[PDB]
Each structure stands twice: as C-alpha cells, then as structure tokens.
Amino acid sequence: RSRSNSGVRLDGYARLVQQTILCHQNPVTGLLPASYDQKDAWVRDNVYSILAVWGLGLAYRKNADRDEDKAKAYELEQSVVKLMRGLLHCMIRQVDKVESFKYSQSTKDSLHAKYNTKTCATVVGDDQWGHLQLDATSVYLLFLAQMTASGLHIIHSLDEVNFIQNLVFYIEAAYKTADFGIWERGDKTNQGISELNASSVGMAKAALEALDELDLFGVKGGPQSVIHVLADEVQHCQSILNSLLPRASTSKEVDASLLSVVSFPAFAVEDSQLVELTKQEIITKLQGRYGCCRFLRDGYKTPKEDPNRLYYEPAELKLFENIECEWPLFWTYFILDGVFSGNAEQVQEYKEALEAVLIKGKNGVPLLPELYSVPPDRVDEEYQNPHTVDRVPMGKLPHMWGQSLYILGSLMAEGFLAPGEIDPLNRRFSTVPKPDVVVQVSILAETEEIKTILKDKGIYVETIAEVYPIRVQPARILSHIYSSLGCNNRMKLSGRPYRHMGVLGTSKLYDIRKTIFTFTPQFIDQQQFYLALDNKMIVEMLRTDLSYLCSRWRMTGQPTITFPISHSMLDEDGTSLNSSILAALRKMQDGYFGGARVQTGKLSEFLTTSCCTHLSFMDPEVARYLDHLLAEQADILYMLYTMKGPDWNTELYNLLTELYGKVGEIRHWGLIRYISGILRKKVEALDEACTDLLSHQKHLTVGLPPEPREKTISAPLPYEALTQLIDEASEGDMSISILTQEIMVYLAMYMRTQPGLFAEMFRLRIGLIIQVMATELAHSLRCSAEEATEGLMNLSPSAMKNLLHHILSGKEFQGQWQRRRRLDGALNRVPVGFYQKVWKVLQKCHGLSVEGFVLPSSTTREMTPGEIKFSVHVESVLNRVPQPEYRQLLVEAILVLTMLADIEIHSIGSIIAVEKIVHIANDLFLQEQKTLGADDTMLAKDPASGICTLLYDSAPSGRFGTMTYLSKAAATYVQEFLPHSICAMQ
C-alpha cells in the first residue's frame, strides 16, 4: 500500500542528484555545465555526470507500480535521454569534422570537447582548445549502446543511426591515433603534443564492443538500425592495451584514468593479471590520503604553476613532484570496481576514505571535491615527506563527473542497482577466460589443374568454381564493401574509410544480397606488395595469422579461413607444390598449425558453423561491381622503364604490373622490389605495424643515420602522413623506401611474437637496420658494400626476415668481437636498465661528456630515470661518436663507472669524459701487450677512433678483457678529479 523503503531511500538519493546534478541541466539542451566558472558542457563530463541520473532512473524503475515513482523514473530516464540526445546534437552539428576525421585522423578535424550548454554550439574554435579526445566520444558511444540496451530510446532517426555508425569509424583508429585524452593536455609535458593514451584506446575498444551488432532502436528495431563493428579494430585496440599497460602512455608510467579502462566503465582489459597489476600500480604511485593523483608530475592546480599560462615549460615538471593535486574522483572508480569485481572489502576501504574527503554543503548533502591541493606554504614539507601534509579542497565543487559515480557507487553498494543493470552489455565479464577457438580452413584451388597437384599429394580441396554458390573474393573487396556502411548523402557521410582487413574480418562468412561471401585473407594479396610472392612467407604469415585468430576470436561460430592455392604457390617447374606450402597444407589436416586447432574441410561444410554476418547495407561503385559479380632481358627493361622518365602514370606509350608479373613468377627479389619502389607499392598495415612497435615504449626512426634526414616516430601517425614521412626520408632512393617499410612489418612481426629482442633497444632505427643488415651480409659471402647493396635487394622476404632476426636475436653466422661491437653499437643495443643506471651515476656527478658534448646532472631532476625522454638525452649524447664500435666501448665504459660508483662512497663532483676512459684504456691496453710480447703489427690503430683494432676484438671480461682495462682506466681519471677516494662494500 505504501512505498517500499527502497523508494523512500531513493528520495534522499533523488534529492542528492537533483540538488547536485539535475538542477544544472540546461532546460533547452539537457546539457550540464562543468561549474559556474566554467559554463560549458564537456562531452566526457556530461556522459559521466549523467550516470547517477541513469542509475537512479533504473533504481526507481525497479518498483514502478505507482504514478509518482513511475514519473520520477520517467524524469530521470528521459533526463538521461535529454543529455545524450543533447550531446548527440552537439556532435551532429559537427558532422563535417566526423567525416574529415575518419579519413585524416588529425586534431584539427576532431569533435569539440566542449560545447555551448545553452545552444549545443561550439563555444571555442578548432585550435583554441585541445579537442581530440577519443575517450570522450567513446564514453558517449559506450553508454549510448548501454543505455539503449537498458531500454532508453536515444537514437530517433536512421540518419542518426548513420551518424553513430560514422562515429564508430571516428573512434575506430584510436589504437593508431594520438589524442589529448581524458585530461585534455596530451603528453605529461602539457605542450600541445597528442599521445597514444591507453584511456582513449581502451575506451574505444569498449565502445566498439558495446556497439557491436547493437540495435539503436532497441528491441523494436531492424537491420537498418544496427551498428556494425569490425573486430579487427576492436582487437587492434587490445594489442595496444596489452603493450601499453600498466603504463597509460609512453610519457606516463601510470594514470588513474586507467581505472576507467581496466574496470569501469570500459572493462577493456581481458587479462586479469594486467587489471590487478595496473590497479596496484595506481595504488603505489598515485593514491595518498586525499584521493589519487591523475598522473605523476601532474601540476594541474598545484600552487607551483602559474594559472595564466596554458602550457608548461619543460623545467616546470620537476616542480610538481610529490605535491600534485589529488582527486577523489578516482576513489569512486575503486568503489565501482569493487562492486563489479565483488570485493566488499574494496567497497569499504574506498567508501570510508571517500567519506572523509567529501565536503558537506547546502543542506548537508555530500559534495565531491574535484581535487585536494597542497597549501603554498606546505609544499616543501610534502617534497621531503610524501603524502602526509593536510590538503585543502580546490577546483570544482562539486565535481559533477566524480559526484555521479559516487552516487552510482552508492546506489550499487546499497542494493539499489546491480552491475548488470548499469552494464546490460555484460562488459564486466571481459576478464573471464576465453577458450581458444578452432579455426576452420578450406584450402581451395584456383584452377582444376592445381586441384590435381594437391590431389596427387593427397589434399582434398574444392576448386574456386566448385564452391559456387559460395563465391570467394580478395580482402580488398570486403574493404570496399564497408565503404557503403553509414553513407548518408544529405548528412554528407561517406561511410567507412578504406582500411585493411585482417583475419578477424575476413574469417567471417558474409551474407550480401542472400549470397554467402567468403573473402581471402589479406596476406595472400599479391597486387599490393611482394610479401605474398614468397611462399615461405605465406606459411609464416599464415602461422601467426591462425595464432592471432585462435586467441582473439570473439564472434558466434568458428572462424573460416578460405585459403586459395595459386600458381605462384607452386614450384618453379610448375608441376609440384612448393615444399613450404606443401608442409603447411598437410599440417592443417592433422589439426594443428601455428598453435591453432585447424578443422580442415570444404567451404560448404562450414556454412552452418561460421559467423554469418548479414551485410544489410548492401540490401537495396562497389555495388555495381557486386551486381555483375552476383549475376630483351628483364633487368634491362627497368633501365628502359625508369628512363622513360619519372613514373608518369599516364599513357606515354609506343603497366609495369605486367612487367611485375613475370618477376613474380621468376621470383627475383632484387628486380621485384625495384618495381615496387618505382610503382610505389605500399603495405596496408604499416600504420598498425608502426603503432605496435610504438606501443611497446619504443621510438621508431626511419632513415639513414644523420639526424635531419632521419625522422623519429614517437606518436601514432596516420597512414598517409607516415608513408609520406618514409618516402621523404627515402631521399629519393626507392629501394630503401620499400626496405624501410618491409623491415617495419618484420620488426612488428617479431615484436608481437618475440618481444624479447627489443628489450635492449629503446629506439627502433630502421634506417641503419638496412645498413647493419648490409654489413653482416657483406662479411658473409665476402664482397663489396655495393654488391651487398645489390645483394640485400635480392634475398627472399623470409630470408630477409630471417637475416633481420639473425641480427636482432644475437645469432652469429675484421674480428669476432669487432663484428659483435659493430653490431652492438650500430643498433644502439644497451643492457636492460642502463638508461635507469645513468640516472644514478649522474646524481653523483656534474655531467657526462662524450666528445665534448655534456649530459649534465640537471637532466636527472628534469626527467625521471624511467622517462623515455631521458633515454633520448643519454642516447643523443652517445651518437656523438660516428663509428659504431667505439660507441659500445663508451656504453660499457659508462657501466664501469656505474659499478665503480657503487663501491665509491664519495662523489666525483665534476665532469667525466666517457670517451677518454677508453683512450687511456686503449693506451693501457697498449702497454700490457707490449710488455707481454705484442708486435706493432698486431696492435694496429683504428684510423678514425684511435683505438687499437685488437682492443675492439678483445673479449669483454677476463684478465686482459676490454672491461678490465676500462675498469682500469675508470680509476685514473677519478684520480685527478677526486684526489681522495674511499671504496667500500667491495
């Protein structure tokens, strides 16, 4: 008869939400201003700030049996619809930016982070603010999918369905797009430098999964209202999340916003060890007694920053250490994580901790402070003793973002809401183990005459024609097809951009206009590049591509890879299958290949046990093609074909792809590469290839050693610009341009499968990689560098990949160690933590000088030991020596100071010339061998360095090793600079 006590207590929560959040909702737009001082509505904050209203509305709807508690449930539900619709109008008024960002992932074409709360218009310009925040649109897209799944009808028209579909392509490239992120400041420096933040990558993955086959019209919807998401981009975000975490970016060791990725609302991390490790990293490095710092060296409202300058100078970062403002917002995330994980202890430690920071206001309602700031006088005390001084609440009061999750956490912790109701798409189960899937493979024959060669080897296949009505197509065709998904001419939306399709996309069965479609996997495409013309590379790519499939399939049915055997995959004779592919095919019949369970069969058998995705946008360019589809010496010719002029690409005739045809059949790699350079054939996955290397805390440098011509990649570059940078860094030589990108695939190939070869290289310098690969193939089969240069063009992709792995793994086919020091200092290979060891030494010194270029101790305070920017500073000083072998002598010379530094209690207190320590070590290496019987002939000087050639060839350790002489000369230099020394601890 009376209202349930749940309804009564929700009234207190209704008052809390109304008095704190819903009283600021704009009457016209439904948007929420950040505060009275900041009268604008942020896309990310508004979505987060509406969660309390959405949770309250769901909580009130649980007992909707009376008129009033139906109505307040309706108000809260439709207030959420008002905000999410109001935020839709803000973004839908910038469809030109969404369309432009899909193709060019630039900051200048990004959806604005803040809008007019009164008119849904852009308050600020495209350059007056840090606008590219892919975790703000994704927080909208994720919850839009979740709120529709909960029953909230937000999307009203099929044009908005197209807009949201086009918004998927907007957030698809989050794994390869740098953005300012959750804190609108980009990197840690706050200098307008966009970076690949795990929050943006994680948020897009969850939003993409949330929108995956989601009907925006609810249950009363159709295929026209379904948002189609490609798992290639979803799992590409995973490859970045796994590589980035527990770090938030290359510049941030950790961010408390990763709590928005590991647990709520993203659930974007599938490995529970990563979730716990990242959450505990936040615990140690960020949490104190007033919340959690956003990220180390934040200084957003620290009293040691001027509130007038929008940017921070590099030296100011060290001023923020240990006195950073602390935000209780992240403690609401830990409460929310505990409710989802089911850790009542966690929901208690962070609830009492948050209840002691909540500032009471108005009629006793709790207000969540935006941040707790150190008083200006007490900054020095927290410098010395961390996280103990009393902080004052500053910033926004209330923080409408954090306040909502506090109420949302309060609602779900007192039994007014369940994790499933706030997460109807079941993202909370992302951490549960997933068994590996059985990859179905249907080997096909392009012609009948290939079916007989396979039959003679005992391979049961159907021909390309026997599979009809099921018809196979290249992976490109599938990419063209999705270019019609989300097309709206009046809204000027052009659908999905052309993106390369991996196996996760091409292993599905496609239902286009009632005709079942299977698409050949992209790594067999031969028109794009020459990686499909090496049959030993088909197996290697196939081996990893099945391994990628089995461990990363998240769709109904089993993946189906249709593998067509082509004439190129046969032998040079033409009557026998190539042994590498021959082994690969029988490998699949036995049921195991590349770590994946392969159930070989015919494409007809796998019709019912595959992911049959209906491509409803094709249901009544590419459609026209599909409509008909449904119904003397060779080497000389290039000298001719390049002296036609620069490639005119027109008909000045009297089509090198035809000339590229025979060389693919004869498989002469030097010639075929040259055609790819002069035709500018370019791989379709270099931008994930670069990003994967980039996401593992590496800087990619492509180009020959000199700095102005060698360009560094530190931020994820889009496909066009990254390729343009490679071509411009190709200084016109087309052979290096392809080898640059060709090695880039192999570097990413080994990085994904064997991460341990790059643990000693923090900067991937592709440009010298061709050089260092040239020297070993020059010393092997001893020949000139030019012959090696012609030789390097000539190896097969598998041989090229093996030889690069021969370089990286440390396997050996002047002198032995001279070849192990020209291969150790030319790749800038340094031991693990050496950049973390220079920091310790420089604190005991004034600097480290190499060839009279100093690396001062001021750098130690300026960047952290683990900062990759510091790694650049130590690295930049170490390339002041041109010759590679001498650099490694400097490298281990640096460490003999490190090991002597630990023994020595006192500090040198002056400059140390790392170069000189080698020189007298060269001089002292000279004297001992003279005394023991060395002739002047054996001790011959290196012409440029000044080191004996035998010293280069000398082993590291031993009585007469290089680091015994350098552990010897690292003491006479300390004699003059340090008159008195004390060595302890042995």
């Binding site: 440390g810 150790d824 060395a934 015994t964 006479t972 042995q986």
Partner: protein
C-alpha cells in the same frame, strides 16, 4: 590424434624454440596443472626428406622409450604421455618456469660453490640412475639441463641417448663439440678403438663443473678442430686469477672427471663419495682414538684460528689495486664478469661460435696470435 591432444591439454603460450621442436606451455583441463609440451615438426617445414622424416620419428619413438624407462625420479622430467601425428609429435612433460642452465649461467656468470653442489649432486645422482639402468646420454650440456623455481635440476633432451647392450660401446658421433669426451673424437678419427661406454657421461658432467664455477668451457677456441686436440690430449688449467679463490676440494674432483683415459675416470657412484658431496648427518657417533680426539680439538681450534686469519687477509677495495689489477681480486673480477654478461649476454647462445668463453680473454693477444 590431435583431438586426443586437445581433449586433455590446451597450449597457451610459446615457452621456447628449437631447430624443429617448439616448447609450449599448456593447461591440463582435467587437473588445471601446469605442464610443458614440446612440439616437434616432423615434416620440418618441408626441409626434411622422407629419410629424415622417418628418422626423426624413429628418434622420437626411441625418445619416448628412454623417458618411459626412467620415471618417478626426482631430477628428470616425466613424459606424462606422448601423442604422434602424421606431421607433428607432441610430448607433454612438467613445466619448468625457469629456463635452461645456460640461461641461468648467463645471468650469474660464476655459479657459487654451494649452489653447484646440489645442482650436480642431483646430476650425479641422475647419472647413477642412467648408468644403473645402463643408459648413456652422450648429451649432458647445460642447455639440456632445466631448472625449476626451487633451482632443482631437470635433465632434459635425452634425444641422443641410446641403451648399450650389456658390454657394448658406441661409435656414432652424437653431441655438440665442446662437451665431447676425448675418446668420442678418437673413435671418430680411428677404427681400432672399439667404442665408448657409459663412462662418457662422467666427462660431460665434469665439464659443467668448469663452466659453472668459472663461466667458460674447459676447452674452447673459435675454430672447430683446435678444440678437439685440447680435448683428446686433455690440456686444461685452473688458470689465474680466476680459479685460485675456490677451495682445493673443488680442483681434484674436476680432474677426476677430466682424465683423458676412460677406465681411470671417476664413476658416478664413487663420484658422490668425494669429499665435496659429503653431508653433515647430525646423528653420528663418530668414535675416535685418543689421537683422533686430540686432532678434533686441535682441528676445532685450527679452524677458528683459520677463519680469523683468512678474513684478516682479505684486502679491502682501494683505488690502487683497481688501477694495478682489477681481475686479480675476487669482488671486482666477479663484478666485471657480471656486467660483462649484462651487455653481451645476448651474444652467448648454443653452439661453438657462441660459447661463453668468447666473453673471456684470459691470454695475451700475442700468444693468441702466435700461430
């Protein structure tokens, strides 16, 4: 069949690699227990001809046999079950979270006397079991030795093993060059020598002693045949400054396995009886003549006095001794070796051109370039 493989185990991650065999970690679904699976490609990517395809199977079929002949023993892995397909041969065994002894010997260049004692105590006690069952290994390299989280030795890759018929001595050359006993090469260079028996394993084990305690093989040089003459002739040296800090009980036991003549070699049963592997059992009466008591009390004094004297002798690290001779004294030499293997620990691998001795230069350049 492969179905039988996946009905009981699920391979998660790649643990190691080989020439044609891949080691992969798996989860046993019925037991949820960690287990290692070695995945040998029988066809070997098509490089293997039908003879090698057949021979690898027969080598693998034999390989199950020895690992089926020895079971339940603490320090060799248990082949839990073996699955054979037309293209692979799966072998599931125990999971060793840590890698081979080679990887460990790379991390710690010189392996301490206490640690090596239990290491080989197992290995010699491993060797006893093989010889008592009359099975020789011929392959006792540290990469063949696997260690677990408690450092326990798990001898692995009995791929070259073969059971001698009672009183029969082999002739085939099986094994990477450094760890080959002198008569292995001699039988390779002559037909009169009628073969080698189970005493082969003794030499290979004694080689680990020089490698573990010094970080280098007893005989190593960059060309192939030159190493061989150091082996058959048997010229080894506990060189200075490296090998002088170890106790004298170490040296004699090293020579015992390293004697070039097989019959005088130190077989496994008496190998564990050398003073190094003697253990202090608390409950021993240990009765002694009055002269025996007088020694003990004198030796108990002689010990205490000794320990004070030895310690007093250790020279603290000073500036000058670093200038004159770093390697000469232990604490700085072990350090130089340690930071030697942190920079170029990737340069040590399996084979002859990648052994650990390449990282040590113990001889003048002139003598090295004498010939």
């Amino acid at each position: 069949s492969a179905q039988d493989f996946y009905e009981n185990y699920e391979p998660k991650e790649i643990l190691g690699r080989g020439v044609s065999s891949v080691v992969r970690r798996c989860i046993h679904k019925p037991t949820s227990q960690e287990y290692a699976v070695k995945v040998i490609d029988v066809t070997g990517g098509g490089s293997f001809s039908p003879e090698e395809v057949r021979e690898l199977r027969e080598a693998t079929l034999k390989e199950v046999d020895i690992l089926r002949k020895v079971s339940g023993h603490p320090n060799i892995i248990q082949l839990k079950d073996t699955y054979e397909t037309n293209t692979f041969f799966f072998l599931v065994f125990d999971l060793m979270k840590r890698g081979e002894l080679f990887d460990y010997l790379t991390e710690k260049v010189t392996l301490s006397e206490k640690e090596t004692r239990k290491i080989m105590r197992a290995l010699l006690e491993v060797i006893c079991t093989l010889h008592k069952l009359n099975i020789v290994h011929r392959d006792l390299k540290p990469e063949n030795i696997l260690l677990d989280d408690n450092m326990n030795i798990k001898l692995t890759d009995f791929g070259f093993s073969c059971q001698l018929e009672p009183g029969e001595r082999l002739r085939e050359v099986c094994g990477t060059p450094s760890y080959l006993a002198p008569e292995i090469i001699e039988c390779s260079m002559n037909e009169d020598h009628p073969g080698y028996g189970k005493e082969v394993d003794m030499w290979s084990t004694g080689v680990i002693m020089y490698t573990l305690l010094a970080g280098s093989p007893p005989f190593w040089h960059r060309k192939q045949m030159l190493m061989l003459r150091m082996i058959m002739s048997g010229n080894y040296q506990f060189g200075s400054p490296e090998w002088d800090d170890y106790s004298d009980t170490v040296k004699d036991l090293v020579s015992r396995f390293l004697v070039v003549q097989p019959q005088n070699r130190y077989t496994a049963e008496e190998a564990l009886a050398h003073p190094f592997f003697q253990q202090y059992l608390v409950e021993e009466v240990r009765h002694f003549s009055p002269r025996g008591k007088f020694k003990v009390i004198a030796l108990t004094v002689l010990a205490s006095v000794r320990i004070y004297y030895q310690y007093r002798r250790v020279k603290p690290v000073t500036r000058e001794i670093v200038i004159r001779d770093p390697y000469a004294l232990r604490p700085l030499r072990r350090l130089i070796d340690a930071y030697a293997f942190r920079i170029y620990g990737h340069w040590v691998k399996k084979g002859q051109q990648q052994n650990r001795a390449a990282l040590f230069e113990n001889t003048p350049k002139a003598v090295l370039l004498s010939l």
